[PDB]
Amino acid sequence: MKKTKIVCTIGPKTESEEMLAKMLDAGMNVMRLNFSHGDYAEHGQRIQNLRNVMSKTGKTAAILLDTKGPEIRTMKLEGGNDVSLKAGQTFTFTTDKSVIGNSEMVAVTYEGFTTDLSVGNTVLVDNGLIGMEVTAIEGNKVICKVLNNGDLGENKGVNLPGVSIALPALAEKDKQDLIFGCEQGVDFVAASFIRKRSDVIEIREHLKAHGGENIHIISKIENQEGLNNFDEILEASDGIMVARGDLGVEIPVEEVIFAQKMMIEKCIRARKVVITATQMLDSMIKNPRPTRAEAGDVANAILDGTDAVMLSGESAKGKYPLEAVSIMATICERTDRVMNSRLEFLRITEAVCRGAVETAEKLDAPLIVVATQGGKSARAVRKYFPDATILALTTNEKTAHQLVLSKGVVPQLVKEITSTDDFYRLGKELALQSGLAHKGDVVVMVSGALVPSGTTNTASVHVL
Amino acid sequence: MKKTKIVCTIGPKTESEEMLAKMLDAGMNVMRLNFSHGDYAEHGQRIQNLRNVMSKTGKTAAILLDTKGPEIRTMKLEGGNDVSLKAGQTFTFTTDKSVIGNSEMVAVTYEGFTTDLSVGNTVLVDNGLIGMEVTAIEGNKVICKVLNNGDLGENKGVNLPGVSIALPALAEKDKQDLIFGCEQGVDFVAASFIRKRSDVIEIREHLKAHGGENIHIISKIENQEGLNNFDEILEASDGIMVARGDLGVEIPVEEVIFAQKMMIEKCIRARKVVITATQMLDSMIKNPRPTRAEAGDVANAILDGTDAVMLSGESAKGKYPLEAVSIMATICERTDRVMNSRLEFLRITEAVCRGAVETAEKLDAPLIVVATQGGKSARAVRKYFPDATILALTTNEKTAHQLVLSKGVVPQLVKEITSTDDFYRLGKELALQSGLAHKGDVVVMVSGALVPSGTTNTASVHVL
Amino acid sequence: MKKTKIVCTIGPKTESEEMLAKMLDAGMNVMRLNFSHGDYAEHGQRIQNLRNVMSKTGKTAAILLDTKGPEIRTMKLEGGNDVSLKAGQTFTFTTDKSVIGNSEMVAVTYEGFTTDLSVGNTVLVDNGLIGMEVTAIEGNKVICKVLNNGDLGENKGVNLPGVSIALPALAEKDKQDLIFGCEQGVDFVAASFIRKRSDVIEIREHLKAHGGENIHIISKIENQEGLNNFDEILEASDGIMVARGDLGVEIPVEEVIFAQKMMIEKCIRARKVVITATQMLDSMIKNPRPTRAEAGDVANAILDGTDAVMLSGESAKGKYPLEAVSIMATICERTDRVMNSRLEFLRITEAVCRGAVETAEKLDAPLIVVATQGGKSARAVRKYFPDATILALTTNEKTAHQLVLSKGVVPQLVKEITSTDDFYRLGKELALQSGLAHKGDVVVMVSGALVPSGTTNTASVHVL
Amino acid sequence: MKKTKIVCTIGPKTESEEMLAKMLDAGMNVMRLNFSHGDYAEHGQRIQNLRNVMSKTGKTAAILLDTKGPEIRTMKLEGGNDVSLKAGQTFTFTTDKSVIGNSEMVAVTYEGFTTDLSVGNTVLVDNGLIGMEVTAIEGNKVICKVLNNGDLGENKGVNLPGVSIALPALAEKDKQDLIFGCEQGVDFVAASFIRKRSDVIEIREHLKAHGGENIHIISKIENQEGLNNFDEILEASDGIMVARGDLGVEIPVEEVIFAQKMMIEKCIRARKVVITATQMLDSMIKNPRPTRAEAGDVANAILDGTDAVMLSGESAKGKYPLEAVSIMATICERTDRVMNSRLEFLRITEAVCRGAVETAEKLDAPLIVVATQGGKSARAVRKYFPDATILALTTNEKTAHQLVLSKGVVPQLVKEITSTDDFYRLGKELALQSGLAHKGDVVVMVSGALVPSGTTNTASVHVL
């Protein structure tokens, strides 16, 4: 089967119990709820239909909450009509949010435009459609020299490549969505426009302040500032989502492929889950089959090493959402089956988990059984891309859902684990029940014995 | 200095002496001539303008001719207006070329349409826009049931995924173009829609018959039949072109990307050139910048190991030919400078060449100087992706040109090389003259000594 | 500090409790009893004196019983006088044991002398002093032509190089000596003159019938036939003793060094103990310091990989018993400490035991703690020449004694181990009690969990 | 055939042309001349019969001269009677060369005895037979306390363990022996009792000052002072001789075995010849067959990596010199056929010669042919212990002789070599004539091209 996990953004056409039941059947693993739109009654009902489907069907899934996040936007123009800009003209941005725009001026929502920017910096409007150079800055106006032609519309996003922007890490609306996340008991939170480590902690504080300590934080990297602080941002998050489309607006186009690859590699080396997202199968919002391009992009993303691939509009609003998940599952299976283990890499956990993967492959073990509380143990084996499927045994309900996103992982919640010998017994029974192994197969069993929950130190080889 | 080579299809906007020179300044190495269109006055002019540009400046490049080839196409419709075909409807193809089409029946260009097809096959019209199922075949009619809605127009290509097609290897015009190739001294010949080894052999007989025995044939793989027989085609060809676009229609969408990787890998091991083509940076036909998607696709083909990447419309019929090349060349460098040698893989030529690269690397040699007659020696080294640049000294002007298409090779024509010790003298001098090495650097020099051409047997180390 | 173990033949000057105590202080590990000489009261007394010192001191050791074995010997001469034989003369051996010899004929003790030999064989008398070539065989006589001059004495041993001899596998006296071995509870039994597997099985039967199922058989390979069947013999024994001296008499002198090197390496591979003996430090029978050569021979034995090195007369019938053992311990200490682990060379037991040693080195673990019943698991670790010391915890007292002979092993007997977590608890306490580890050191612990005795499947890393 | 080379000390029973002829047929390669005894006419004549034998048959050998060297010896006793020394007694050595000795005091030949020695140092007389500890030093006498009983005889050697001895670097007679060496054109010189680099330099000055500039210095390591300065001594010398007998008396006995191995390895890494000498097959001075210990001591010296093994009294003054060499050859061979290459270890000669050997083995070439004038080229290849035999082609007659001592090297004198391509021509022809390779076999050819002598930079692979 496939090992790479599929995040599906759920929307009006896919929030029914009947659809979610088939969305999982087709390969969906994590439900994404995009709070950029929708209201608390909408999502809470979507959450309920899934937990209804899971309870009745017996399948497992995770639920991810994604924040709107901070952003800079233009506003309206006179007559609400587009305006055509010409290169070389002088253009001006104003802080005054009460101004209606025109061909010489438009208003912006963030006052720190003047302080953060400096003469020589570039300003990009509407996903980089129109670019401009800042030539002078005065009070409540920002003077620019237009660099390229384009049609400016109303309420368009603005980007400042290579510039340290001083936005708040979260908007006030974000704070309320996060709190709703804690009340619902969500498993993951993906936070938009994370630029620096301080941003990651502020979310962690807020979740800690409302019972979201056991919630894993997924930081979305979207610009060069985030990329520049990526190492620190990874250290502070529980995982990463690579938002390739947005970064493409911020950095040289040929670096994006090497930005995604590095980040995947660094998440792998760190035993932290990674999602590759945006411009995945966009051509399928309207079409029943994807491009040659889209599938190859996805296939290179799995070969880079990502844990998960994410469907956005394709599944929340698309006209062929079920076909999108299904073909994604076909791409993942086809791509996952020709990848090899990565047995390189002094922690005790690292030495033990890496050796167990080599031993699994040295014995053609179809399954590596892992006892985990917080999930680090299943993620330590995953770093080595084992051919074996990882059945992770836990009593912690959150852990089981969160491992739904880790590559190659099959979570199974169990009542209790009393000792090291019990783990081997219980795991042996369950290895047969899971159907992934059979009598006569070898399994490798990883646990921590007489050590804290944070370390993995034991490896044992059993026959089923 | 990039190692990957760029093929550019030259057209009206890029056929000037002044422009071609600016394409070469920008990194162009090979001129492609797409003989689907244009006439002998047009093509002969491009060849002359290049040789004028080459003659005056001293830069060197290659000339590749790309054939139209055999094909199956629809014909004209009533009133020359589009007709909408509906899923479930019955549609029919006819052999009678004087029949006007309609919503229920159209004429085809291939008379063997009925005999080649069988009950159950899929028929695709206009690059897969509309697909149909064959339901019956009788005489001069082909009966089908339409599977998807779309407008069938005039002059639309026909594709038979998973179906073995029995067309001829050359059209009468193909025969006339190749002879013009022989007459003009083309360096390469690209052969479209290669399905079997016999297709390549037919071309070789043709080319040998007009004094172009030394002209390299690069087989373009364009359907599922070619892919099944790829191994035999490579043996008979001099190289391969991966046509990702055309294969995208003939084979399941999740297989295409691995067909590229597989096909490229075998070209490397065989010491035969491989080009990745079609759907490179198409969007630059209209836009002055590529998408993030394209540049990741292109560069990942370089990481696969491709020798050369090809521009089609971007440089033939496009608005931004210089911008297309430059971003291509910048992608080649950004990608090439992070790729490593591949020093695995009982022959003499290989053992010496693999040893020469490993020695050069262990001694921080910037350069491998190679004495070659037909270039087989330069292409044996290239297999291992050496960090060091290859200075290929030859007395055969065709080889000097043909070796411009291979990755990392800087060819140099010489008056003579009388002996092995003579080669070391001259090769050391020319290494310094090129500016690619400097006094004191280590250079590694590979030649055949006291053996006929085609074998490389000697490897030597000098300080400049 | 040393890892190689020292076997000592104990004799009149070293059988007192006061000596045994100082021999262990000097490095002795195993006592050997040469049943070639002595009677049941002497050997039984040595066993008692050692076990008294063990009881008083708390030190541990093993008891090895070495058999006389079968043999072919000359017999009595006229007047008990030496006779001089001359090269070229005819000499005759007779089966008639009532014939008194002289310079033309002597009797032998083995009735099969006439049948086993053939015309052309070599006959060697008195440790190779005198050689003869068989020229004819008639009735009860073997006729020979003497090849070199020498003095034939009374009761001289005979060697028949390259001849398959039909002697019994055990002497009638041997049968009783082994029964005494069982009665006393010896740990090892070394069996002389093993030629074929059938010999080893007869010994195993004999031990079974008197309660010696737990006694390990150590087969002494002493002739060409022993060597030819070495595998068949090794498969059935629990170990090997290399009889260097006799091998010099049976096989070309250039092969003996390569018989030894093999036997050690194949014993290493089989997880079965190997002892190197004979011609070790003979010169210390009379002198207080060994040869330059002797010390070099002894050290190359340890480097080949032998588990233990053995002293004979040096410690049994000699003037400097403690000085010899002491210098032996100095050679072992000095030699062992520059030897390296061997991390090469399907089964489960092997995969884990090689991984535990590879884990131990990557973590600088000074000790590898093993729970073992029958000693196999502790011996499976040693196969890889671990830098670390092996602390083998067992409840089988015979195993605890027998494991004193395997290189690098420290036995410690315990009451019980009820489970895998219990094993880790106690092992950490007992690791520190031994003084071989300290707070902060890492230990690796090898066990069998939920499998029967004979398989090793679990390895675990703890910090003390 | 064997690769290890044999040095033989030649004497009266082994100086006849007929016997030298039989010594070479049996495997003798280098003649040793021990200037401890004999006079210039005797040594000059042995030199003559060899160069006569070489010329007549065409078989080849080299000539080595061994110095007596400086030394400390006791002198004569009263009535020339042995005196019995007892443990604990006071004994005294005197500088006065006019004193006749007795049981309480004897004279020594070295004036610096009092100044070099110190209270607490050990004094050893007659192969370490009697040892004494200095208790006081006054005027020209050194007082001692004897440690063991023993009989002191006349004219006995003295050894001072761990003491920096300030004798001259050469004895006065040695200077004349070297001058005699320069006259005869000996190829090698063994210089005894080398303690420091300055010692080797005094010899080098002396040899050059009399025209022996191309004579190689083989420094004899015999005491602790040399060992501490070994690195410089090898660096300053042309090769090393391991004199195990002398070391056995000067340093702890368990260190001797590692002193041999270390020096053999370091000479290997330096591309400098190493001879292992003393206590090789001594038992054959009196016996026609060697000991198992001796057969193993030598065979382990070859496995250690020695270029040469040396016979002393065995071949100079013993009863079975011819049998000794033959069995020495049988051991060398039996061992030589089981050794493997050692292909580790960024200099140009190193990179190229190591690459040729792996390629030689990757193609099963039975021969590597090397072009050398100063011999460095063959000794760089030999270092990696190639299976292929090194056919070393040279124009320097001395070089051809000096390479007779180097392991696995077959020297060949040739008229001239006019080019690199000439070497390939001639080398292919001579490879076939030599009988070591045949038509269809691969040969690997190593030469230096367009560089000064001392550098090897070219490797070429040819079919015969």
Side-chain angles (χ1 to χ4, degrees), chain B residues 59-76 78-96 98-99 101-144 146-184:
Chain B
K59 307 185 179 176
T60 192
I63 300 149
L64 172 149
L65 190 149
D66 195 340
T67 69
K68 219 170 181 308
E71 54 181 5
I72 312 171
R73 309 187 77 78
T74 56
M75 315 197 146
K76 302 197 195 182
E78 279 166 52
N81 272 262
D82 289 4
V83 176
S84 298
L85 307 186
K86 298 284 278 167
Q89 101 173 43
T90 300
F91 196 96
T92 298
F93 303 88
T94 188
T95 297
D96 201 331
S98 282
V99 173
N102 65 9
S103 67
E104 306 213 320
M105 183 192 309
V106 79
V108 297
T109 304
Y110 173 49
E111 303 162 4
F113 214 71
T114 56
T115 53
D116 285 282
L117 281 166
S118 64
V119 170
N121 294 355
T122 288
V123 179
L124 299 183
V125 191
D126 188 332
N127 298 283
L129 184 79
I130 300 169
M132 298 169 209
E133 194 177 341
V134 178
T135 52
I137 300 170
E138 303 173 6
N140 66 10
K141 299 185 183 74
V142 178
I143 298 304
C144 299
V146 175
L147 293 175
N148 64 293
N149 296 322
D151 285 49
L152 167 59
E154 297 183 306
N155 197 4
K156 302 299 176 193
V158 183
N159 296 302
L160 308 175
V163 170
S164 302
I165 307 98
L167 267 83
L170 288 160
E172 202 276 337
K173 181 62 174 176
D174 289 329
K175 289 168 195 197
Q176 234 56 50
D177 303 324
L178 301 176
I179 295 177
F180 171 78
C182 299
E183 294 170 6
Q184 291 289 323

Side-chain angles (χ1 to χ4, degrees), chain C residues 8 14 70-71 121 124 172 190 213 254 256 258 271 293 304 329 336 388 393 403 420 447 449:
Chain C
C8 300
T14 57
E71 54 180 4
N121 292 157
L124 301 180
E172 307 300 63
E213 58 181 357
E254 70 273 27
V256 178
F258 289 108
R271 292 155 264 102
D304 294 336
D336 287 343
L393 297 186
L403 279 170
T420 295
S447 66

Side-chain angles (χ1 to χ4, degrees), chain D residues 307-316 318-341:
Chain D
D307 293 289
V309 289
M310 182 171 109
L311 290 182
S312 293
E314 305 89 320
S315 46
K319 284 185 171 177
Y320 299 100
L322 216 67
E323 291 85 356
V325 177
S326 202
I327 194 60
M328 180 69 96
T330 295
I331 293 165
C332 284
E333 200 284 323
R334 175 58 180 87
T335 295
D336 281 348
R337 78 186 184 65
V338 300
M339 303 182 58
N340 287 125
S341 62

Side-chain angles (χ1 to χ4, degrees), chain A residues 346-348 351-352 354 358-359 362-363 419-421 424-425 428 442 449-451 457-463, chain C residues 346-348 351-352 354 358-359 362-363 418-421 424-425 428 442 449-451 457-463:
Chain A
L346 295 80
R347 292 294 111 182
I348 293 176
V352 167
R354 189 219 68 83
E358 189 183 337
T359 297
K362 205 177 288 149
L363 295 163
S419 72
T420 294
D421 287 319
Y424 300 153
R425 232 194 305 282
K428 285 168 77 188
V442 164
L450 283 68
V451 296
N457 73 342
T458 305
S460 185
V461 178
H462 294 262
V463 183
Chain C
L346 192 49
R347 286 293 163 283
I348 296 174
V352 167
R354 191 213 68 88
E358 191 177 335
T359 303
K362 208 82 179 194
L363 296 167
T418 59
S419 69
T420 295
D421 288 316
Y424 300 157
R425 200 200 43 85
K428 286 168 75 190
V442 167
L450 291 185
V451 297
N457 68 341
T458 300
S460 181
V461 176
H462 298 263
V463 180

Side-chain angles (χ1 to χ4, degrees), chain C residues 258 300, chain D residues 2-6 244 260-261 264 268 274 276 280 294-310 327-340 342 382 385 407:
Chain C
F258 289 108
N300 274 329
Chain D
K2 69 180 174 67
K3 292 195 197 336
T4 301
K5 301 301 176 40
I6 299 169
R244 305 171 310 166
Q260 169 181 309
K261 289 179 185 297
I264 291 156
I268 279 164
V274 67
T276 300
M280 294 291 296
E294 288 166 328
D297 191 16
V298 177
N300 276 249
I302 305 188
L303 298 168
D304 295 332
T306 193
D307 293 289
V309 289
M310 182 171 109
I327 194 60
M328 180 69 96
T330 295
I331 293 165
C332 284
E333 200 284 323
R334 175 58 180 87
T335 295
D336 281 348
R337 78 186 184 65
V338 300
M339 303 182 58
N340 287 125
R342 308 187 181 176
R382 167 264 162 174
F385 288 84
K407 172 163 182 166

Side-chain angles (χ1 to χ4, degrees), chain A residues 296-344 346-356:
Chain A
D297 182 15
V298 180
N300 282 120
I302 306 187
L303 295 169
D304 293 336
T306 194
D307 291 282
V309 290
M310 183 169 116
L311 288 180
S312 294
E314 302 89 319
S315 47
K317 66 177 177 178
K319 191 167 176 184
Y320 297 103
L322 211 63
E323 293 83 1
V325 180
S326 302
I327 189 58
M328 181 71 95
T330 294
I331 296 164
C332 291
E333 209 278 317
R334 177 61 173 91
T335 301
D336 291 354
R337 84 188 190 214
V338 298
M339 298 182 54
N340 298 318
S341 61
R342 305 188 182 174
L343 298 174
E344 296 95 321
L346 295 80
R347 292 294 111 182
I348 293 176
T349 289
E350 279 199 6
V352 167
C353 288
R354 189 219 68 83

